[PDB]
Short mmCIF file of C-alpha atoms and ligand atoms in Angstrom, two decimals:
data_model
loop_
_atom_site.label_atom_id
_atom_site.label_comp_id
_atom_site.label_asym_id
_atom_site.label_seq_id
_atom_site.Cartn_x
_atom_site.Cartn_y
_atom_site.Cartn_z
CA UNK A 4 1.13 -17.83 2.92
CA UNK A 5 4.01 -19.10 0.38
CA UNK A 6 3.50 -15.44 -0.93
CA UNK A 7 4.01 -14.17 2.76
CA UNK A 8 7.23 -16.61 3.06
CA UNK A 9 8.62 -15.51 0.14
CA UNK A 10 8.23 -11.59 1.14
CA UNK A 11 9.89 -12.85 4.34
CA UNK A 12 12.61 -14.48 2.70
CA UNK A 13 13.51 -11.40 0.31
CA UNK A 14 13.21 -9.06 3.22
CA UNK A 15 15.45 -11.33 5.03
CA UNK A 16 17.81 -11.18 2.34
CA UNK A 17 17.82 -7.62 2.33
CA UNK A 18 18.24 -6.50 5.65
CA UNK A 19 21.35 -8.87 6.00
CA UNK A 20 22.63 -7.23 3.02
CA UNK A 21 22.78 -3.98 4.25
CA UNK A 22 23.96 -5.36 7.69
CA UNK A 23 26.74 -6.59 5.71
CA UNK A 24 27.31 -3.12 3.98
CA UNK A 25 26.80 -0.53 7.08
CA UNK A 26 29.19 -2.75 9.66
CA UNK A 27 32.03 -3.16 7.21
CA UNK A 28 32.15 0.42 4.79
CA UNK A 29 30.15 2.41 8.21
CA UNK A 30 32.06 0.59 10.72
CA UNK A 31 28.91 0.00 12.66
CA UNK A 32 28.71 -3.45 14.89
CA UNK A 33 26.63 -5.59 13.35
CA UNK A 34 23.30 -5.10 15.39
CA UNK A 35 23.51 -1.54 14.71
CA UNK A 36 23.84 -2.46 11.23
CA UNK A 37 20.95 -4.24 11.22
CA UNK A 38 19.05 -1.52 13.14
CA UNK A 39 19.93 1.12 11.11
CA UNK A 40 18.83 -0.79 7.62
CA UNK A 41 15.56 -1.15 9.16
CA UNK A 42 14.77 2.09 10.63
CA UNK A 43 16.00 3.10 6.68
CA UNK A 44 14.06 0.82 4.61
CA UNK A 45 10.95 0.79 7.24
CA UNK A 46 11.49 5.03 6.29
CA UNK A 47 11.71 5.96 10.53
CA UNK A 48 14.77 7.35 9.83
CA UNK A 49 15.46 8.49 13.47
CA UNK A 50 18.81 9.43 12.09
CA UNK A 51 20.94 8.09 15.17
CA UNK A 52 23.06 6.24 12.72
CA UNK A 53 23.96 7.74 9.22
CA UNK A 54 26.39 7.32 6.50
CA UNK A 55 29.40 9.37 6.65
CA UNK A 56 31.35 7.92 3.92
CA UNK A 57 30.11 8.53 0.46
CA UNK A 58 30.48 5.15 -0.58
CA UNK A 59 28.14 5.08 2.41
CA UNK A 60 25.19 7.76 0.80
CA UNK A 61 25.74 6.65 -2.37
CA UNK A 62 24.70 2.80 -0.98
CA UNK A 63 22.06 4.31 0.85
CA UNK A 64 20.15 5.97 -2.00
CA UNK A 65 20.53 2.70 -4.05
CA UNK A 66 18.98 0.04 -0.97
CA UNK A 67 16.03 2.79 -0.48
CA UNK A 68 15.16 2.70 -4.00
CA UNK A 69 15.31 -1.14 -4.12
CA UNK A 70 14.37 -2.00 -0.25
CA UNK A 71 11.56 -0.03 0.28
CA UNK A 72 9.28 -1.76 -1.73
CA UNK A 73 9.93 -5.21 -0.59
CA UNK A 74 9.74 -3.67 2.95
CA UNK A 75 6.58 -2.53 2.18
CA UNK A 76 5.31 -5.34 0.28
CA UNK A 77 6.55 -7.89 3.44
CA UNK A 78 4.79 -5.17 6.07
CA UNK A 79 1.63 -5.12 4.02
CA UNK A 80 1.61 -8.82 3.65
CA UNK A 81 2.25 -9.49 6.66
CA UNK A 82 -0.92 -7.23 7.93
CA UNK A 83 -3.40 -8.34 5.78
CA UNK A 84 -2.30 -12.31 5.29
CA UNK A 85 -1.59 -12.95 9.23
CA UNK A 86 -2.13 -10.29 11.58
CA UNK A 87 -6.08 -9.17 9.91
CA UNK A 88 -6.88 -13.36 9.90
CA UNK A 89 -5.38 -13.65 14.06
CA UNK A 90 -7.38 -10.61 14.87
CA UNK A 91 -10.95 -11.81 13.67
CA UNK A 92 -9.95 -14.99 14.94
CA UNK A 93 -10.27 -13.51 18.35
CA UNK A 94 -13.17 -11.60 18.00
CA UNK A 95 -15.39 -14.89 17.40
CA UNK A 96 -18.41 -15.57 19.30
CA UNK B 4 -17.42 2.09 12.60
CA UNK B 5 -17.13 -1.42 14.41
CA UNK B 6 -14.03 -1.85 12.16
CA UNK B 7 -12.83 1.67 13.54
CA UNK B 8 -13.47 0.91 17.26
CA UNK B 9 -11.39 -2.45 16.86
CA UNK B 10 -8.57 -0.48 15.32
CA UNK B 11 -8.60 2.28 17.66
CA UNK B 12 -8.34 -0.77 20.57
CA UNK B 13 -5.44 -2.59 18.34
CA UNK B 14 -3.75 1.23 18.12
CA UNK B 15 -3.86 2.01 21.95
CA UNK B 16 -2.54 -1.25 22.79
CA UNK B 17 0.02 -1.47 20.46
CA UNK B 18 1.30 2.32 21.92
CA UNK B 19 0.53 1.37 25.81
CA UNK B 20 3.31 -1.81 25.22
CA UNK B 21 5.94 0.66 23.50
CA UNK B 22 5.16 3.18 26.36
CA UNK B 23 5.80 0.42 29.00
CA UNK B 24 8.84 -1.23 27.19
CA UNK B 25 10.39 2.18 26.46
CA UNK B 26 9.91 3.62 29.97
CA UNK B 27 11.34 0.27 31.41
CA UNK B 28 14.22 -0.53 29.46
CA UNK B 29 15.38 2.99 28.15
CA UNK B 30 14.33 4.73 31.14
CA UNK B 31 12.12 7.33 29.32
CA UNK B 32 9.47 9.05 31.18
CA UNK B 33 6.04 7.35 30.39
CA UNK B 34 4.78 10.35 27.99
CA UNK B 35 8.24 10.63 26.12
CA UNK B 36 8.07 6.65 25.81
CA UNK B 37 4.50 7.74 24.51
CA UNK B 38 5.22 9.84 22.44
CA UNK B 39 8.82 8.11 20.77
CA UNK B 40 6.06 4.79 20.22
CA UNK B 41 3.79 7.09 18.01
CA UNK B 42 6.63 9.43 16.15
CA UNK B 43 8.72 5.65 15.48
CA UNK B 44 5.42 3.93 14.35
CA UNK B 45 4.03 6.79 12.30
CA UNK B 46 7.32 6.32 10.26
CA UNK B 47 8.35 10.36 11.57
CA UNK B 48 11.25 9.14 13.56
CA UNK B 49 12.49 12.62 14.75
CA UNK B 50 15.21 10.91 16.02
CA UNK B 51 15.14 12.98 19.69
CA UNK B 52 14.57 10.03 21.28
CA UNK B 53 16.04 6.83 20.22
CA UNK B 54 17.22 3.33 21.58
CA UNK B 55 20.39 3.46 23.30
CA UNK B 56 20.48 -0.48 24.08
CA UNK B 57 20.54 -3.19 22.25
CA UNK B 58 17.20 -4.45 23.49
CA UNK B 59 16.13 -1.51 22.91
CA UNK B 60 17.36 -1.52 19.13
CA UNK B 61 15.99 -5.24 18.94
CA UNK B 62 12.18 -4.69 20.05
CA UNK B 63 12.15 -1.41 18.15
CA UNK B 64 12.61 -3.56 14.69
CA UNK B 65 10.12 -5.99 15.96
CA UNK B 66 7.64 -3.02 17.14
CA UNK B 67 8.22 -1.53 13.58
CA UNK B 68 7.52 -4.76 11.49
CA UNK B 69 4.01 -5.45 13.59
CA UNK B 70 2.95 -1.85 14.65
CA UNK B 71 3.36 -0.04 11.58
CA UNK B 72 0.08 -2.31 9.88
CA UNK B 73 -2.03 -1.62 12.26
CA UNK B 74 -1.27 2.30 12.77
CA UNK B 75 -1.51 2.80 9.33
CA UNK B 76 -4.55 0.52 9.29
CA UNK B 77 -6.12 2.94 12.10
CA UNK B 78 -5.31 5.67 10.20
CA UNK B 79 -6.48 4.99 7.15
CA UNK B 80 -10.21 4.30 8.32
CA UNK B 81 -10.01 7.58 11.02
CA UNK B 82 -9.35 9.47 7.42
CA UNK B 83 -12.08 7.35 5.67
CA UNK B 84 -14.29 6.51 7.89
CA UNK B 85 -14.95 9.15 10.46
CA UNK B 86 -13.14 12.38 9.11
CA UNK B 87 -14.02 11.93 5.22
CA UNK B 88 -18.12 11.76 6.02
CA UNK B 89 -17.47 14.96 8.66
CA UNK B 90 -16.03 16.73 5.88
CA UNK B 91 -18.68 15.97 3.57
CA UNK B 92 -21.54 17.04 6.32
CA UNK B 93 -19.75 20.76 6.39
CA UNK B 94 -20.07 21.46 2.47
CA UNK B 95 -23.85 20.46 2.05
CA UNK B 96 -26.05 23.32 0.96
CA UNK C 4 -10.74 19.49 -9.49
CA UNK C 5 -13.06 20.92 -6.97
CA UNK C 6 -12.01 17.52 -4.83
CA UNK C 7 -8.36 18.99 -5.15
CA UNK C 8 -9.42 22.63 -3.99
CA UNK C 9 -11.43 21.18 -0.53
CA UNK C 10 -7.86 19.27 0.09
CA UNK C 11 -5.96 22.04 -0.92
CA UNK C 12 -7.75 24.34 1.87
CA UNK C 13 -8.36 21.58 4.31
CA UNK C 14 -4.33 21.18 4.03
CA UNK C 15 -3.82 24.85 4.03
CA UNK C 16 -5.98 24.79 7.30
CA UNK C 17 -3.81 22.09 9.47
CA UNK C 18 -0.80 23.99 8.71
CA UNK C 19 -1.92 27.44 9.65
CA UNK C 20 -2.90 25.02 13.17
CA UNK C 21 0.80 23.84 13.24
CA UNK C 22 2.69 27.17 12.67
CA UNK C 23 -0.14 28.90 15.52
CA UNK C 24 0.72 25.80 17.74
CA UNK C 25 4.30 25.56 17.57
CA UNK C 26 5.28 29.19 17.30
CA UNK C 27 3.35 30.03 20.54
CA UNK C 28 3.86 27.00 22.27
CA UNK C 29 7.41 25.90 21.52
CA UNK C 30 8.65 29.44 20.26
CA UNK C 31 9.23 29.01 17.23
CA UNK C 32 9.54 31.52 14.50
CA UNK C 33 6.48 31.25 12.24
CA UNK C 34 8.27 30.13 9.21
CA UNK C 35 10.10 27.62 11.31
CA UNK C 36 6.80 26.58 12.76
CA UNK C 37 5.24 25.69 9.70
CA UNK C 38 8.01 24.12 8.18
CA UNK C 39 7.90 21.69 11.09
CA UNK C 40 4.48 20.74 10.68
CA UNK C 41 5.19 20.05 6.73
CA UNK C 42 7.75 17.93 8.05
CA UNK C 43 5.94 15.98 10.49
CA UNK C 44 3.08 15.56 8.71
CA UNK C 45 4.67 14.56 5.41
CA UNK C 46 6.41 12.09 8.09
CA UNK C 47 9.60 13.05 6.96
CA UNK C 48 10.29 14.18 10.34
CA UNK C 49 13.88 15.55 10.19
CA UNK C 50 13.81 16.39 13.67
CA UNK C 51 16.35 19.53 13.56
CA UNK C 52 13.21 20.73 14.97
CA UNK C 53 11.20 18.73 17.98
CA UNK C 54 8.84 19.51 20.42
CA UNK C 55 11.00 19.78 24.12
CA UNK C 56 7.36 20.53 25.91
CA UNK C 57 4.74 17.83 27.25
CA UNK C 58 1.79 20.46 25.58
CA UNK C 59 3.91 19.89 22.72
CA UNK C 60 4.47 16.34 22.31
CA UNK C 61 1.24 15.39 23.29
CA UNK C 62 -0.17 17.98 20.41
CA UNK C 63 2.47 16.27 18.23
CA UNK C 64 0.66 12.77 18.75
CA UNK C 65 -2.73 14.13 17.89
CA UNK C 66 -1.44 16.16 14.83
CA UNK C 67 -0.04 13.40 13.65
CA UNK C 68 -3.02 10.68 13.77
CA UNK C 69 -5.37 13.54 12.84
CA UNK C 70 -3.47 15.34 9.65
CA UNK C 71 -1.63 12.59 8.22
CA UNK C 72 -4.85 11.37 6.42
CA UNK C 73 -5.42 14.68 4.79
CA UNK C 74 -2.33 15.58 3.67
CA UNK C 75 -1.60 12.38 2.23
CA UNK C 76 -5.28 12.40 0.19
CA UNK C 77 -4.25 16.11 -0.69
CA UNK C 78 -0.83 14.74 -1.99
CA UNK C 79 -2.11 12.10 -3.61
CA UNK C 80 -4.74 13.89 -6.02
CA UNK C 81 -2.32 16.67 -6.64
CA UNK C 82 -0.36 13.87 -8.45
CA UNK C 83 -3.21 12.27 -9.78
CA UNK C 84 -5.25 15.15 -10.58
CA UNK C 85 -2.98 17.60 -11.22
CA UNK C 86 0.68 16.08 -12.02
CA UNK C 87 -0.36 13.04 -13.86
CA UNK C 88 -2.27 15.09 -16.33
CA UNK C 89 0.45 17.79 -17.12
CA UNK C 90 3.09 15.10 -17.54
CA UNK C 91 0.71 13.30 -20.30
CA UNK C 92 -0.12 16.27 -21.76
CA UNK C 93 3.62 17.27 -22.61
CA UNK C 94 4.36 13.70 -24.05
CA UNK C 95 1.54 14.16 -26.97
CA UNK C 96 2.72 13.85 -30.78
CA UNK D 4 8.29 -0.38 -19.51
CA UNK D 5 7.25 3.17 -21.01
CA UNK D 6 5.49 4.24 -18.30
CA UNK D 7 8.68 2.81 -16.21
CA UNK D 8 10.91 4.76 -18.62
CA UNK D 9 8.90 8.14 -17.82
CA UNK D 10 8.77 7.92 -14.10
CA UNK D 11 12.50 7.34 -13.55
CA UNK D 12 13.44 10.17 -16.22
CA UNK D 13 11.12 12.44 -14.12
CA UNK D 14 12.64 11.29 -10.84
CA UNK D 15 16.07 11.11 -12.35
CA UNK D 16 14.83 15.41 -13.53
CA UNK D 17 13.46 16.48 -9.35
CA UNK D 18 16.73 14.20 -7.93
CA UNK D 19 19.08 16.68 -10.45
CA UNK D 20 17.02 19.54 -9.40
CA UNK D 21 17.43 19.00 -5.56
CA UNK D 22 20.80 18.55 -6.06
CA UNK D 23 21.54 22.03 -7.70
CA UNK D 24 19.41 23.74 -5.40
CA UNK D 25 20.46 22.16 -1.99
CA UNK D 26 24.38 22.52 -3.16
CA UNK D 27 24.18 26.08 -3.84
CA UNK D 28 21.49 27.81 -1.54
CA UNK D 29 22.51 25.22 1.44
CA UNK D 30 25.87 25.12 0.31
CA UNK D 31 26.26 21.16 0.17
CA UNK D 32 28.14 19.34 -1.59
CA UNK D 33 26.68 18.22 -4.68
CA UNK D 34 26.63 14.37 -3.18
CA UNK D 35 25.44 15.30 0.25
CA UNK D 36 22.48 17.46 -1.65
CA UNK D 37 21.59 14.24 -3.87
CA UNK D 38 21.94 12.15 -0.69
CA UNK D 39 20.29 14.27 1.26
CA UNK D 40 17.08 14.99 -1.45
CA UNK D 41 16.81 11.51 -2.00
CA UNK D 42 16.82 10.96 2.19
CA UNK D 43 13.97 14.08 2.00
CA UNK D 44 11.66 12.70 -0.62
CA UNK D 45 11.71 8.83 0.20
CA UNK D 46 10.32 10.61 3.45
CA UNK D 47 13.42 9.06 5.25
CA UNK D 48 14.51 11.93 6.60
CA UNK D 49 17.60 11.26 8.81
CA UNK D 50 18.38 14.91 9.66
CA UNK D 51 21.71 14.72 9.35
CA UNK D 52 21.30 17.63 6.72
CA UNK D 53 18.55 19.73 6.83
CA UNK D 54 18.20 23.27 5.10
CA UNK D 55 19.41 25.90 7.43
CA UNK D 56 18.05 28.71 5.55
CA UNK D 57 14.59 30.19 5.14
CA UNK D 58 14.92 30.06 1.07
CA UNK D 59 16.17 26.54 2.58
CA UNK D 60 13.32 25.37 4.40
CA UNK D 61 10.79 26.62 1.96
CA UNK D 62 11.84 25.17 -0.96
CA UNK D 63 11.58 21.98 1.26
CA UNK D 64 8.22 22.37 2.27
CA UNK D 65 7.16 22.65 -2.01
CA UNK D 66 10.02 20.14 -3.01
CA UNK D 67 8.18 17.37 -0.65
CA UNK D 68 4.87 17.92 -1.38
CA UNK D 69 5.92 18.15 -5.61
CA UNK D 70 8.36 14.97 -5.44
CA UNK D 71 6.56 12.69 -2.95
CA UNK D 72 4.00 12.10 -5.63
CA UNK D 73 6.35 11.01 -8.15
CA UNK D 74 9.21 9.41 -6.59
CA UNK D 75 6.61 7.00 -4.91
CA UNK D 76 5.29 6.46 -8.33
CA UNK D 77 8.72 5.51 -9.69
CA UNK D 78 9.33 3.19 -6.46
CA UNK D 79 5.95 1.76 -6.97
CA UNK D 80 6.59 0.60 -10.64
CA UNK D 81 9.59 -0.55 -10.21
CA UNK D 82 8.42 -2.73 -7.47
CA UNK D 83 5.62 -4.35 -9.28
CA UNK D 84 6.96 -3.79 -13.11
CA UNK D 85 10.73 -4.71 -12.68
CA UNK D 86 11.60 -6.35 -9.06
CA UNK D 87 8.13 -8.01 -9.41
CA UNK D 88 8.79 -10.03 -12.75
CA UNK D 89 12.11 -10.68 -12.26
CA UNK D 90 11.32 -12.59 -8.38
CA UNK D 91 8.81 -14.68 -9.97
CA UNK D 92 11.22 -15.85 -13.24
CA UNK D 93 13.50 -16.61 -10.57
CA UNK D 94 11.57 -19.11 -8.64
CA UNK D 95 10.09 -21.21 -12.01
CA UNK D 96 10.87 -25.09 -12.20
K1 K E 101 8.23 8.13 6.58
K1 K E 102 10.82 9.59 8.54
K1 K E 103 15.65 12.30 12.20
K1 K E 104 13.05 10.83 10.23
#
C-alpha cells in the first residue's frame, strides 16, 4: 500500500503535468487537458483531441515514453494490491 | 476455471455499467454504448464514438483506471486458461 | 521455434477471419479489411476505419476479447524467439 | 545500462526508419511521420494520420508487429532500470 500511494502520487504528478502542457501550448480547457493525457498515457487514444502544434507532437512523444510506464505500473498496482484483495473479500463464505 | 468464471462476471459487469452510463448521459444507443465500453477498455479507442460531455470525459478516466485491470485480467486467463489448453487438444497425435 | 510457427498460423488464421468478415460485411476492400483487423487487434485502433454496422460492432467485440490473446503471445515470442536472438547474435566479438 | 543502451539505439534505428518511410511514401512531414510512428507503435494510435496508401497500410501492418516488440522493451527498461532507481533515491532519509 505505500508502494500503491506512491504509484498514485507519481501518476498524479503526471497527469497534471500534461494538463498543464495540453491547455496552455494546445489551448485545450483544462478538463480536456486532463482527458486527453489520460486517454494518451492509458494508450485509448480515441484521437478526439490531438496535438496540432509541433511543440505539441514533439511533447507528446516525450510524456508517452516517460508516462506510460508509471501509468501502467499505477493500473497494475492498483489491480493486484486493491481491487484482486476487495474482490476475494467478497467472495467469502 | 473458477478464477475464469469470476472474471468473466467482473468483465460483464464492468461493460453493462459503461453501456448504461454511456447510453444515459451521451445518449448512445445501448449496443454503440456497448460496444464504445469494450473498444475504450481494450485500450483500441477507435475514436468513432467518444465523450462529448464533461461527465462523460470524467467517468471515462475513472472507467479507464478500474476497468482496464480487470479486462486485461479476463483476457489474459480466456488466452491461458481456456483457449491455450483448446489449442493444445487440436495438435495431439 | 515450432511454438513460434503454431502462433504464426494461428495469427495468420484470425486475420484471414477479419479481412473475410469485414470485406463482406462492412465492404471493405480486402487489403483494407485486413489492415483493420491488424489494427484492432494490435489495439492500435486508428479508427480511419470502423465498423458503421451492428453485425459489425458486435463481431468487433468478440474479435477483440477472442484474438487479442493470440496475437499478443505471437508478438511476444517473435521478439523473444526470434528478435532477441538476431539482435545478440550481431553484437558478438 | 548496456542492455538500456541497446534497446534505445534500436528504437532510436525503427523511430528513424518510420520516419523516412511515412515522409516519403505518405508524404508527411518528417515530424508528423516521427510523431505519427511513435503514436503507431506505443499502440496509441490517435488517427489523426494514418497511411492512405496500400504500400501505406502494409508497411503498417509489418512495422507494428516488428516495433511493438522492441519499443515495449525499451519502455519497459527504462521504467524499471532508469525511472525505477532514480524514484526510490529520491524518497531516502
Ligand atoms: K493500446
Ligand atoms: K489505441
Ligand atoms: K483513434
Ligand atoms: K486509438
Amino acid at each position: 500500500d505505500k508502494e500503491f500511494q506512491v504509484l498514485f502520487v507519481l501518476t498524479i504528478l503526471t497527469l497534471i503535468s500534461g494538463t498543464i502542457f495540453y491547455s496552455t501550448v494546445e489551448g485545450l480547457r483544462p478538463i480536456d487537458a486532463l482527458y486527453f493525457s489520460v486517454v494518451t498515457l492509458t494508450t485509448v487514444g480515441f484521437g478526439d483531441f490531438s496535438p496540432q502544434t509541433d511543440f505539441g507532437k514533439i511533447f507528446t512523444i516525450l510524456y508517452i515514453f516517460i508516462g506510460i510506464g508509471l501509468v501502467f505500473g499505477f493500473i497494475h498496482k492498483l489491480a493486484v494490491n486493491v481491487q484482486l484483495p476487495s474482490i476475494l473479500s467478497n467472495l467469502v463464505p
